[PDB]
Symmetry: D2
């Protein structure tokens, strides 16, 4: 009898089911209110019912809950100060996808040492998200697979599907059943069609495989997600300017989906240079002042301390993509608030 | 207390676990032998140790197990006839990914009527795959998600990751733990870099989330898959010709991965016209006759009857992509066997 | 230096297929469902004195061969019909007999009779037999020895037992309080009736106990109570089947405020462990029914195709646990009881 | 279709699996050492290698973890003081079995209000047991079913099977795979044969049904438990005296099993008068001074405050069987330590 099963598998270990984490860390009344309200506020921006600017802002990746919470406390002050112009939500992404081998993020490898203590990672991720919502700071994340959402999607006010997965049938099927609004990034080399197609597909009912809250293999039947939109993040060339926004809007209208979109100030739009995020933001600010009718949001990579480092040595500094520091964040947010204040006069 | 969980979910239904199907349909001694041997024979092609041509050939999708088994019976005679020149493996794909709403395939919706009887669909797919191996025909399939392989990957001799998922981090993590060799298709518009990158990534150990054979949420730690290769399937223009093969081989060598590749005669290489598959095969044959050192395999969409139909009215005729019929299949295989006989004799 | 403290004396823990895997392959039919539902109600009617037919739980000590069980049931079915106005005949379908010294663990635990313990196959085979019996028109009965097996096949059971060794057990009484079927509690090994009277009372109330869901996951079960429990007299140090003993049991049952209708086992300790004495017990019960017998609602008999017992399964239709009466004796015993109860019912 | 399934069931609710509790409350290195060594120490008493007296002492039932921990802190001082004569282990029983309807114990109904919050119950039981072991106090309990051991038996140094279940085949099968030594109580009316038979059965390998640590329906194959003994707890008349011990010992030797036994001072030996436990203990002390070679242990129902109460009003006072209070406990342990010192000196 020749072996055919699990030939290239080192180990398959049981995980605690979602319901174990939900039992220890139930969503509170106040967190559930914030999540509910923020999802609705964001849908209003997606569909042009309100003209505040969504701002998804925070670290490239979370590697230290302490720093994240300090960041959120500073950010909360500005979320409140600018609440008539901006809808500020913290970027709480646990991993950056990789081609070359490297750190698998705070959920998969919380101890930053290759031990892959995923039960601890998921618990810590849920704990941080609950703490954020409890302090008044809504959270956003990218969903990389079809199982992690069951552990903490209830605490997420906006979700992303990344460039590497926007075209994936199963990730679009996932998006169609996510409780939050969902942004789809354009493709790595700039392809907008995959994102426009994703919004259309995610609006419909689908089935996909995942687990129950009790941790058992399941088929999920979704209702469709009416609150999806594109995220422009460059690729071919940066696509943040008025010309590119106009062309994307045209193509969105041709497909019969929302022509309100988000612009990422970082990644391929900054050309991996954190010092250009302000320049992109300045360009968007000028669009918002002149007209900017198709913009509903921006994304910004921001941390306590600017730049990046290979090892987690400096407190509050990214170990993935380089981020603007806190002082520059204050400036960038003041810029956008002032420009959108003007746009809202119309 | 505001609701925040499963807001856009119609139903979450626990499935029978893999162990239930494996009890009803254990892999036989004969089927285990065939799978084990075929996986090794393919590894030998991927790594240039044998110069037979792998031929992945069969329906675009399986919608009728009766027709599939009939097809396999005919194909088996040619698998045997050409065993010194070609390694013939049946294409056994249960679904074609969609953008616009349509049939979800024989696993998800086996009754072709929107009932989504997935417990029946998984049973039936396993049964067909066991029957195929038991008759002496190895099987191949595309893995669209991270859970289905637990139900039947033990019966699969060669696996594919399609154009829409080659770039996906989690689908590369999956491939790194698949027991079979894996082909990665180039991107929808022709992007080969994603597939080259994929082979590299898939050769390493990774972690991803799935279920145990008992159906429980799990973390999977893989060993890496040394037997991955790219599949040329066209883009904006076809990419089957010697010039494209030569450049792909140089890029594969530049990345330090295998420079032996597979060419799809169908999909974008046929410009979506089943009558052009033979012309692609004729070009491949000329390449093999002249040199063709970088070719290890071909893919062909073939069925009992040529063409396609919207409803399953005609027996043995595709309801997804149009396929060549049985007579043409005999001719195309004869063509490839003859050309490769000459390549092998050098 | 973590010292080991978990599973120190465990050779292996293996996953079982969940109940729902067996239910998927072998769903209860519409016919079987009807028979189970009506037979349970018919038995309730006997327990509560609303009908004077005699329940007869009859068949092998233990099932070790499905073929012989189905042949047995075909023969018995003819008599179930013939005597339907006097007797309510249900086949005894017990897969195991409990042991103190090591021996065969029964057809569910060790279906292949060779210590391989292929329990997935054993449970499937048990469910298949029970479904086949109900489909042919023969209702089935069984003894429940643990709190998990009922999820696999209790839906096919018309009458359940809790044995002498478990009647006093808190958890087995909790189980009984949630079983869909009527339940008989055997008196204790040495004759103790009090534990069975107490069990009927306890089992009538709502309880909670641990088990598994149909999907096979650890679970707490909250029951509604079982109003259809009764005692089973099966002897002790002395047999307890005679009129004096039945009259005493009924006084104690009424004193406790629970049903004073009971079942009498013709086998085991009432037969003094001798299969050739079952008829004597049945003849004493016949005489009670003719004279009065108002407190008897049923009897239990160990019966097979072929009389006696054997130490290896060589003779087709012959017990490998307790010796049983053969088929010809089974015809005689049932004829005897039907005649006697016809007279009781006419009064 | 007539209904036949779960006719008389109000609800079936899935529990958190053992792995969830094990994650929150892993056994510590120190606790694992205490458990491991205490089990071996008790095995030594069972097999007559050591002549210390095992003392299983504590509340009839635990209804308040705070009182239990306070009790343990006081008892630990005496465990240490008398460690050369007595092996003191705390009685940590969560439930007393009932015939008439009443409180189902701290695991099944921790809130003492009929809410049956068993997930909270199991967590709290495990938490108390871990705390006890961590402070240096080993714990003992009675196992009433075949599932609860999966949640906390790793923390138990000695286990009991009670009078109502000693004869049960499945409870004997359970005992045959318990990691701790096990005492079997004589039957309600005094029957010793069921406990002698239980020791023999439990020494052998058995199979029984339960759940895996992940909570899945399982078959358990045991190795046999060589460390079982009887517990004399009275019958129609008490059975603690020299004459009864002598007779039980003769029957044990006749059966070929250990003739070292435990005597319960409470229950049907005190005839449910807590003030008689000291009288039983005095008789046992006299046996130990004179010969007492078959006695390996005693059991005593003891709490902070003597007596019992129907509602949990007074702190540290039983709501199940009446117990001796702390002062009487000090006296009883001093008495037994002195008497066994003389026994061991022979
Ligand atoms: N629980 C997710 C939806 C989901 C269900 C099941 C699997 C995966 C995702 C949400 O509320 O957004
Ligand atoms: N069982 C798969 C590998 C796998 C394990 C677990 C989850 C998914 C896939 C194979 O043998 O190829
Ligand atoms: N399913 C059983 C009741 C039961 C439920 C859960 C566990 C055990 C028993 C019946 O119908 O009789
Ligand atoms: N885990 C138990 C043994 C056991 C295993 C499985 C089920 C029940 C009990 C122990 O270590 O004592
Ligand atoms: Cl669920
Ligand atoms: Cl009880
Ligand atoms: Cl259930
Ligand atoms: Mn980034
Ligand atoms: Mn196709
Ligand atoms: Mn018997
Ligand atoms: Mn007590």
């Amino acid at each position: 009898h020749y072996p055919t099963d699990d030939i290239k598998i080192k180990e398959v270990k049981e995980l605690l089911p979602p319901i174990a984490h939900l039992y220890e860390l139930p969503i509170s009344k106040e967190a559930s209110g914030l999540v509910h309200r923020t999802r609705q506020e964001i849908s209003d921006l997606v569909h042009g019912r309100d003209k505040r600017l969504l701002v998804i802002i925070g670290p490239c990746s979370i590697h230290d809950p302490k720093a994240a919470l300090e960041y959120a406390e500073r950010l909360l002050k500005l979320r409140k100060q600018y609440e008539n112009e901006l809808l500020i939500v913290m970027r709480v992404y646990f991993e950056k996808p990789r081609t070359t081998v490297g750190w698998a993020g705070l959920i998969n490898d919380p101890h930053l040492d290759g031990t892959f203590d995923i039960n601890f990672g998921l618990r810590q991720a849920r704990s941080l998200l609950l703490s954020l919502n409890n302090m008044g700071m809504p959270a956003s994340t990218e969903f990389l697979d079809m199982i992690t959402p069951q552990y903490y999607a209830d605490l997420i006010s906006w979700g992303a599907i990344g460039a590497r997965t926007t075209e994936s049938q199963v990730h679009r099927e996932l998006a169609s059943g996510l409780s939050c609004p969902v942004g789809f990034k354009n493709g790595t080399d700039g392809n907008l069609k995959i994102a426009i197609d994703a919004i259309g597909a995610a609006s419909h009912s689908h089935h996909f495989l995942s687990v129950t809250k009790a941790g058992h293999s399941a088929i999920v039947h979704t209702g469709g997600n009416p609150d999806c939109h594109v995220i422009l993040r460059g690729g071919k060339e940066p696509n943040y300017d008025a010309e590119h926004v106009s062309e994307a809007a045209e193509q969105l209208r041709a497909a019969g989906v929302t022509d309100k979109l988000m612009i990422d100030c970082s990644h391929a739009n900054s050309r991996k240079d954190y010092t250009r995020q302000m320049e992109v933001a300045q360009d968007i600010a000028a669009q918002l002042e002149q007209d900017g009718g198709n913009i509903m949001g921006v994304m910004v990579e921001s941390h306590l301390v600017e730049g990046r480092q290979d090892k987690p040595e400096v407190y509050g500094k990214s170990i993935t993509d380089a981020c603007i520091g806190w002082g520059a964040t204050e400036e960038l947010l003041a810029l956008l608030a002032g420009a959108n204040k003007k746009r809202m006069a119309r």
